[PDB]
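Design review, sub-item: ligand-bound model
Attendees: FS, YL, KQ
YL presented the inputs for the magnesium ion complex:
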Amino acid sequence: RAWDLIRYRNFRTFTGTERIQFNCLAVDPSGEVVCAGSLDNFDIHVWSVQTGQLLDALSGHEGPVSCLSFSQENSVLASASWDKTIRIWSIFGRSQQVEPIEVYSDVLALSMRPDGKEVAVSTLKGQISIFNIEDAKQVGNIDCRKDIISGRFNQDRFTAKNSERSKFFTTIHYSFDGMAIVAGGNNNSICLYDVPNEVLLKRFI
Amino acid sequence: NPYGLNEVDDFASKREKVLLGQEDEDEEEVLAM
Amino acid sequence: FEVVEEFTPVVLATPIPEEVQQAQTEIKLFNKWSFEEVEVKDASLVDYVQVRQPIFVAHTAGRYANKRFRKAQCPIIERLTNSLMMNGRNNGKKLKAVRIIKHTLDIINVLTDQNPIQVVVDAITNTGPREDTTRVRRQAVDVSPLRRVNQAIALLTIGAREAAFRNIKTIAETLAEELINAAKGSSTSYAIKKKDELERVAKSNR
Amino acid sequence: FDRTAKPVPVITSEVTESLEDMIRRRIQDSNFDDLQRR
Amino acid sequence: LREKAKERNPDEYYHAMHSSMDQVKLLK
Amino acid sequence: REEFNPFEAVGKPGISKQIGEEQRKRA
Amino acid sequence: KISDLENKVTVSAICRRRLPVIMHRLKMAETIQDAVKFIEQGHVRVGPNLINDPAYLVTRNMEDYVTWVDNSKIKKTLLRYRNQIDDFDFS
Amino acid sequence: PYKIFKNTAFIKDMFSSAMEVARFEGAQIKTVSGIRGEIKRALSKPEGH
Amino acid sequence: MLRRQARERREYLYRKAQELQDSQLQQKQVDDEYAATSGIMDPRIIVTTSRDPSTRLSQFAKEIKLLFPNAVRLNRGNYVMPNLVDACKKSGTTDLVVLHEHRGVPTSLTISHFPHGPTAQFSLHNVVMRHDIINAGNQSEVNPHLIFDNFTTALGKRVVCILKHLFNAGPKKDSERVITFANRGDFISVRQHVYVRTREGVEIAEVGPRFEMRLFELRLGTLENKDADVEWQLRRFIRTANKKDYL
Amino acid sequence: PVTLAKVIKVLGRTGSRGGVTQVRVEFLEDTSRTIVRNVKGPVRENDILVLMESEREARRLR
Amino acid sequence: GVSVRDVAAQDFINAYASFLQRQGKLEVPGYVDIVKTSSGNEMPPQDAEGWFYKRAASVARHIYMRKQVGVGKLNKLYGGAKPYKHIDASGSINRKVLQALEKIGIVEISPKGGRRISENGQRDLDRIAAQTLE
Amino acid sequence: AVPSVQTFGKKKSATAVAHVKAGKGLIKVNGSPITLVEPEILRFKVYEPLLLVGLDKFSNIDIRVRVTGGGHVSQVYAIRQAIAKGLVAYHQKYVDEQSKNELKKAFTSYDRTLLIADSRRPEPKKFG
Amino acid sequence: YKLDVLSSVHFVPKPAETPTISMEDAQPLYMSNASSLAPQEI
RNA sequence: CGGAGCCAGCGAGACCUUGGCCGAGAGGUCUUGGAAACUCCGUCGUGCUGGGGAUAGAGCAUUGUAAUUAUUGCUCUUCAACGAGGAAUUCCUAGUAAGCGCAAGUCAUCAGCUUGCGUUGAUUACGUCCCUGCCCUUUGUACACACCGC
Ligand SMILES: [Mg+2]
Ligand SMILES: [Mg+2]
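KQ shared the predicted structure:
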C-alpha cells in the first residue's frame, strides 16, 4: 500500500495474482517503482506506482528473498536470499542485467551505503560482508559472533555458551556518513561497528 | 508412520510398491591331507 | 626503528627453490618482471590500461565479459594473451599464448635492456588511434579510451601474426619486433602505419 | 508385403488447396481457436 | 533405485553412522 | 493465389515433390 | 472446498505437522522419541530460527528448510560417515 | 542378425544388394520368437545388409 | 532446495492422477498445469537446439523463434540438460523447445512445459524453411490468430492445449496473421499465412515455414527427467500401427 | 599540440548515427570551458578524450 | 628419504637412461635401429643410440609408480592416437625392455602376473633419484 | 590425537581434498612435492596462496592434497582453492581467530576464488 | 490465534449507552476532512 | 616429426578380458577373473619443403566361405589436386564462438550418422532508434503529489 502522508490516505494498493505473502519492500528513488519479496515465491514482484500494474517478476533467486534495497543514487536494486547469494539488478534501462555474488551462508539483512557504491549483508554465520557493487567483489568483512550477547532461556536444556539460537544479526543499517553500521537481531545486543576499521565501536544491552 | 500418511504420500507409497512388485557351513577345512 | 614479525629461520620439509623465496617478497610476471616502475605515459589511457595489480602468470580465470567495462580492470598482459589465440586452429589454446608472451618478453629484454612490460605499455599507448572516421563519404569523430586500447591490442597482435604467417620469423620474435617498433614510434611497425593512416583520413574529413 | 507403420504423407497441390479452403472459411466466419484473457 | 538415489535427504541420520593361503586363513 | 504462395518470392529447387508424385499417379 | 474441511481436518492431520513427526518422515530421526530429544538439545533449526519446542507445527513453506544446526555434533557425524566433513564450513 | 543394439539390429543374408533392400524399406518382419520389427535402412557396407 | 522440487513432483503426479479419475468418472477445462496461468500471464519461451548445431538447424531454430511472439533463442554450447532446465526455471521460462537435425534437416521437436511438465516429443516431416524462399522478406510478428483443426480425441485436446499456450492470450481482432495446426491422420500440418479481407471473401498468402509434426511421446515431467511417467507413447510395432489414428 | 577533455555528460536522444555518441566534455586545462564532441567507441562519464582540434563544435551526424 | 616421486619425471628418466647406457649391461635387441615403437608412428626414434635405454628408464619408473605392470598396460601406456583408433604401442619392444630390466635385477616377475619393482632395483632407482637432487 | 582439518576445492569436474595437520612444513600433491605440480607454466598458481601469506605460516603444518577429475587447468585451480581453505580452517580450529581473519582478508583481497567456489552457472542473459 | 501460536517461532499475545472516545485516529486532529480531498475530487 | 610427461565425465539384456610367450607391425598362441587437444626436451626449416596423402605396384595377415571370392588391417615404394578461396551469402553475445576427444544407439529419426558426456576457451558489443523491419498510442482515466491539456 502507498500512503500519502500530506493527506494521510492510502491512495493505491498493489497485489499479486495469487496473494503472495510479502516480507520485504524496496522503493525506487524516483518513487515510480516499488518492489516486494516473499518467503514462498522466490520472485521479486515489481509494480508501477502511477498505474499500480505488475510490470514483471525479477526471477533468478533459487531461495526465498530475504531483503531488498534500491541505491538512493545509482538506482540499482540489490536482492539477497537464503540461496547464499546476492544479486544486483539493473532493471532501469533498455537492457536488464543481473550480477550474482556468492556468499558463504544465508543472507538475513542487507543495507545500501548512502553513496550507493557498496552493499553490506549480514549472514547466518554471524558475518557482515561489504561488497563493491560496480566490481561485484568483497571489500571488507566483520566478525560478530563473539560480540553478540544471548541469554539462556528458562526452558533451555543446554548452556548459553554452547547455544547457537541467535548469534547473527537479522537487521543492519549504514550511518549516513557511511563509516558505521548498527546491527541487531533475536538477541539482547545492539552492536555498532566501524566499517573501515572492522572493529566494534560499542555494544548496547 | 505412527501418525499415518497424507494423501500425496499414500499415492507415492502405493506407486513405489507397484514398481517393486513388478556349524559345518561356518567352519572351513584347511591343510587337507 | 625496526619491526620484526619472524624470529625463526624458515626451512620447510618440502624444499622450495630460492627464486620462489624471492617471489614471496614481491610479485613479478613469470617471477622475472616487476610492475612497480611501470607507468602509463598518456594520461587519458590511465584507468583503461591496468598494470597496478601484479600477477605471476597471465592465466587468471577472471570474469570480465559480464559487465560493459570490466575489461578495463583485466591485466593488460592477459588481454594481450587472449588476443593472441585466434584464426580457428588456435582458438582455446591459452597456454600457448602464455608461453609465446613469455618468450616475447624475454626477447624484448634481450634486445633492449628496458623492462619489457614497460615496452608493452608504451606500444599500446602509442598505437591507440585518437581520431577516426564514420561512414555518413566519411566524417571525423573522436575515439573512446577503451576503443583505443582495444584497437591497439588488436593491431599489434594482428600485425605480429600476419608478419610471421609465412616467414622464418616465429610469432614470438615478430611480436617482440612489433612491440619494440611501436614503443619507439617508428613507422616500421604495422600498427603505427594503420594508426597514422586512420588519423590522416580523419583529418582529411575533419 | 505389409508395412509396419503409416507412410509419411505427401503434400500435393490438392492437399494444399483443401487446406487453404479450411483456412479461408475459418477467417471468413472469424472462427479462431485462440487463447483469451481470463 | 534411481529415485531413492535422486531424492535422498543428506540430513538423514542413523545411530549406526557412529560405528600359504591356508596359513593366512588359519592365522586370521 | 498462385504468385503469393512460393511453396508450390520463389522457392529454391527441390522444396516440393509434386512432379514426382503426379507421375506415379499416372502410372 | 469448504465441505471437505468437515472431514479432511482430523487430529492426525495436525499431528503430522508436528516438528518431531516431520523429522521422522525426513529420516532425520529413527523414532519420534529420538526427534524430540534432538529438538530439546537444540540440534534442529527451521529456517534461520532454532526451534527447541517439540510442539512446534511446521507450515508447508518452512517444511523444506528444517535442517540440522550448523555446528551440531550430529551433523558432523553425518558428514564424517560420508567422509565429506569440510572444516571451512565448520561442519 | 550379426549386430544387435537393444531394439536396433543389423541383419544379413536376406538380401543380396542394397538396391533390393530399398524396395522393402518399411516392411514388416518378425523373428521366430514372434518379436515384430521393421526394415529401416540399407547399410552401404556390406551389400544386402 | 532439491527437497522442494522432490515434494512438488509428488504433488504434481498426485494431481494428474486425481484429474484422470475425475475425467474417467465424468466419462462414465484447461489442464492442471496450464490452469493457474491460462489467460493471465503470457508465456516465456526458450528455443534451443542439440549440441553443435549445423547452420541449417540454427536457421530453423531462428524460424521457430519467429513463430512464437514471446520466444528467445539460446545457444547450446556445452550446456547440460539438468543445468539447461535448472537455468530455465530460475529465469522464469515457461516452455523450452529443443530441435534435432540430421545433416541439416530438422527431424524432431520436443516441447517441455515448466515447472513440472508435460514433455511432448514430435517428429518433423516435409520441412520447408523460409530461407528456401528467395526474396521472401521479413515476417510480421503480431500476436497471431490460431486455428486448431480436426482435434477430437482427449489426446487431441491435450495436444491442442500444449500448443495453444505457446502464444499470448487475446490477439487483436484485426490481426492479419494466422497460424494453423491441421490434424490429418495424426500428421499435424503447420502453416503460417497473412490474410486480407476482400469485398467478396478472404485472400491468404503463405509465409512459412511448412512442416508436418507427429506426436510420438508425451511424459509427465521435464525433458531432463528420463524416468518421468509416460502419459502416452506411440506404439509402432502393433499390428494396427499402420492405420490406427489417435488425434 | 593535443588537448585532453574529460566527459561529464553522455547526451541522449540526440538522433546520432548508430555507433556514434554525442558527449559534453570539459577541458583539463580550463575546467569551466566545455565543448560538445562526437565519440565513436563505448564512452562513459569521467573518461578523458584526446582532442586533436579543440575549436570544432559537434554537429549531429544522423 | 629421497624417492622417485620427489624427482621430476623427465629429469629422473634422463639421468637413469644415461646410467643404463653408461652401465652397458642392458641387453638391447638388434632391431632397435629398424623399428618405430608403434605402427601409428611414421619414423623411428631420432636418438638411435639411446632411445632404448630411455625406454627402459621410462618403463622402470612406471613399475615404481605402480607395483604390478604387464606388457599389455605398457602398450596402452605408450600408445597414442592415429576416424581415429588409439592404437597401442609395439608389444615387441615393451616385452624386450621388461625382459632386459630383470636381467639387471631392476624388476622381476610379480606374483599373479606382471613385473614388480625388485628390492635391489628399488634401491637402485632411489640411488639415481638422490643423484639428481645432488 | 594429532590436530588436523580437511577441506575441499572444486573447479568444474576437478575435486581436490586437502588434509592439513600439525607438522614440519611438508606440502605434497598426489603424493609428490608441490614443486613438481604440472603444467609448470601454471605452477605459480598453486604457489599463489603460499606466497601471499608467506611460507612462515606453513612451517608448523603438513599439507597433503589429493586431486581427481577435470583437466590440468581445473585441477590447478582446485589445488590452490583447497590449500587456501585448509590453511584458513586450520588457523581457525587450532590457532587464534585473529590470524584466521587476517588470512581471510589477504586471500579475499588478492583473489576471492581462492576461498569461494567459482561456478559459471548458466544464465539466460536475454530476459525472456 | 490458536493456529498462529502453534506455527509461530516467537511469542504471540492473545487478541483482545455512553459516548465513546476514539483513542486512535486515522488522521491528525488539526487536519480537516475538507483538506483531505483533491481538487479533482471536489 | 621423435622421445618423455600427464588430466575427464556420460554410460551395464559364447563374448570380454588381467597376465606369460612369439611377430617389425597387423596379428597369433597359452592361461586367469567377469581420451584427445595439451606440457617439457630435441630434429627440421620458408623450399609445394621433414605441409597434403589421392592414385598406383609389391608383400605379411584377419574374416567368413568353398571360392584361387571379396572383406578388413599392417610393411615398403610411388607422391598428385590443394599457395586461405569470385559475384554473393548464413549464423552468432559467456563457460558463448571455436578447438578436442569419449560413450550409447534405450518404440519417431539416426549408423562414421543421431544424441549425450566431459576437456580447452576467447575477440567484440552489452548502446541506439540514425537506417531497415515489426509493432503500440493519439476519450490521463491513472486513487494522492507532480506533469500534461482538442
Ligand atoms: Mg559449437
Ligand atoms: Mg549433431
